């Protein structure tokens, strides 16, 4: 947290090295970040302190916290050709309890989208919006096709690209957030490249439990213009099926409507209503009132 | 009637379209259990996805493209100056016209910058204008009228 | 101060922003049309062999040519009672192999 | 609507394990339920 917070405050080019290495050497190491990661971080932060000393008022406050946090870790972790090899481990290990964190990797991407749009305060915004959209599409593809090598490559590319574009080319509370939320995406992604994809990846997400929350979220997702349609076509292109598109989309419609009926049938078994009982006046006056 | 005429014509249109599709799938059959080829999928799907992006982002983009334009340096043609004492006829009147109206050279703009370098509010104001936007009206000190 | 004369300045204002949003909504509902209730017309669009219906539709037309208008009425009654009984369409439209 | 939910979820399992011959045969059942209004009043009845 502190390594990344330093880059949000200082925003230099010296404090870029460590955040890149967190996302591409530490978080992608299977057993545990090794001694060499921690020693690199300690040595680099000491250097930057000396270099900035030998050259404003604020300069070495956040770096004092950093150095002292890295030496705390060391104390706990003491009380208890190479490139090819590193990559080989990640790609083919044996300590891979599998998990599915797509749901959430996506929510982070939605939240970002919103920040860019709401806080538009323009070519910059325009290009960035397209970028975020295009990353989301590629992400879905690698999920449905279950590739860990592809996700590794997408991570490497994106980490470097965002850390360069937003810290050299482009240049702000808006951009400070966008960054925090994209950092959470890069963390969750690395968990998936280290843990591996499961066996059953297809299906929806809100259609697992038949309650009332689920019904309202399902129906809400259908209202956002274009989401339902893009999901369907995207899943068709990447999943292996014998059916066309007309037929794919007719299976997906039957399922949506059978879900909604199922949810309503459940609610009326949990909360039954007596035979021959008038609908209460409050319900009537509320619904009707609004419509009128 | 007309309601019934038009219901016979609709049944025929749709029975034709089904018949055409049934024929094509007898001339070019597809094996049982054979996945739809990736090319077909990526083509059809691809287009649809693209259309959706171009119905959301592209409109905005075009409007923002329109907004990338310029402004025009409207230098004064005449700088008319009068000094009037009370109710009486002006003591002095002069009309500094085109030649007397001299746009700032890059040197005159650097001179202005130097003169106002001690005032950060003055430098913030000067930096909003180009050398072409700043004109010196050389108003002649003799009244152009008796 | 610099003056400003735009050429396509009709696309200006927050009313134009609101207009854009409204357009998206409308187009959105149009696209939904194709992806929503496509399960309600499966009875009339997934017919296995549409040949026996093509003969009835083409016989209504022959009768109109030779002006034997009494048989136009009796053949309209067959077409209307195929489309009014979902199960007699699963007998008329079956693959006769 | 429970027996239809099982057919819809079995089309999905087959897509996962790539046994695409059964995706075709289970699509045929779903399409012939929605093409015969009276076999939906047999499949969707409350089995009490």
């Amino acid at each position: 947290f502190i390594i990344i917070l330093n880059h949000m405050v200082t925003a230099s080019a010296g404090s870029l090295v460590l955040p890149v290495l967190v996302f591409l050497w530490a978080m992608l190491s299977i057993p545990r970040p090794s001694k060499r990661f921690w020693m690199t971080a300690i040595v680099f932060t000491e250097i930057a302190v000396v270099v900035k000393y030998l050259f404003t008022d604020g300069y070495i406050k956040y770096d004092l916290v950093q150095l002292m946090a890295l030496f705390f870790h060391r104390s706990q972790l003491l009380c208890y050709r190479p490139l090819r090899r590193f990559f080989h481990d990640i790609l083919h290990t044996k300590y891979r309890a599998a998990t599915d964190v797509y749901a959430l990797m996506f929510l982070a991407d939605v939240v970002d989208f919103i920040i860019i749009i709401f806080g538009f305060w323009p070519e910059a915004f325009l290009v960035m919006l397209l970028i975020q959209f295009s990353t989301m599409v590629v992400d879905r593809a690698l999920y449905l096709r279950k590739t860990v090598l592809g996700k590794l490559a997408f991570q490497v590319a994106l980490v470097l690209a965002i850390h360069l574009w937003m810290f050299f080319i482009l240049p702000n509370v808006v951009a400070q957030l966008w960054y925090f939320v994209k950092c959470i995406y890069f963390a969750l992604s690395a968990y998936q490249i280290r843990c591996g994809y499961p066996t059953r990846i297809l299906g929806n997400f809100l259609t697992k439990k038949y309650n009332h929350l689920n019904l309202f979220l399902f129906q809400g997702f259908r209202l956002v213009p274009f989401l339902v349609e893009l999901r369907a076509v995207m899943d068709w292109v990447w999943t292996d099926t014998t059916l066309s598109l007309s037929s794919w989309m007719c299976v997906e419609d039957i399922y949506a409507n059978i879900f909604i009926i199922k949810c309503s049938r459940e609610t009326e078994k949990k909360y039954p209503q007596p035979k021959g009982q008038k609908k209460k006046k409050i319900v009537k006056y509320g619904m009707g009132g609004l419509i009128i | 009637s007309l309601s019934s005429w038009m219901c016979v014509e609709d049944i025929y249109a749709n029975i034709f379209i089904i018949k055409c599709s049934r024929e094509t799938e007898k001339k070019y059959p597809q094996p049982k259990g054979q996945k739809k080829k990736k090319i077909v999928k990526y083509g059809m799907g691809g287009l649809i996805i693209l259309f959706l992006i171009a119905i959301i982002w592209f409109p905005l983009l075009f409007m923002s493209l329109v907004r990338s334009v310029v402004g025009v340096v409207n230098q004064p043609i005449d700088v008319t100056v009068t000094l009037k004492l009370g109710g009486y006829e002006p003591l002095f009147t002069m009309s500094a016209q085109q030649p007397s109206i001299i746009p700032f050279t890059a040197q005159a703009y650097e001179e202005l910058s130097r003169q106002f370098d001690p005032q950060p509010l003055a430098m913030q104001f000067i930096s909003q204008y180009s050398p072409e936007d700043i004109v010196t009206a050389q108003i002649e000190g003799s009244s152009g009228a008796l | 101060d610099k003056v400003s004369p735009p050429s396509l300045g009709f696309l200006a204002g927050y009313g134009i922003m609101g207009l854009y949003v409204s357009i998206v909504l409308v187009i959105g509902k149009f696209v939904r049309g194709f992806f929503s209730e496509i399960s309600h017309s499966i009875m009339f669009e997934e017919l296995p062999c549409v040949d026996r219906i093509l003969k009835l539709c083409q016989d209504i037309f022959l009768v109109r040519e030779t002006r034997e208008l009494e048989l136009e009425e009796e053949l309209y009654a067959k077409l209307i009672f195929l489309y009014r009984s979902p199960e007699t369409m699963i007998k008329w439209t079956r693959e006769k192999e | 609507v429970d027996r239809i939910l099982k057919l819809c979820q079995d089309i999905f399992l087959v897509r996962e394990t790539r046994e695409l011959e059964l995706e075709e045969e289970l699509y045929a059942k779903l399409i012939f339920l929605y093409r015969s209004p009276e076999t939906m009043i047999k499949w969707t009845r409350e089995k009490e």
Binding site: - | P29 | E95 | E24, A28, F32, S36
Partner: peptide
């Protein structure tokens, strides 16, 4: 053939 499997359901599947 694919299209003779998709279009071949009967009333016997929806039996017991």
């Amino acid at each position: 053939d694919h299209a003779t499997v998709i279009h071949s359901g009967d009333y016997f599947l929806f039996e017991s």
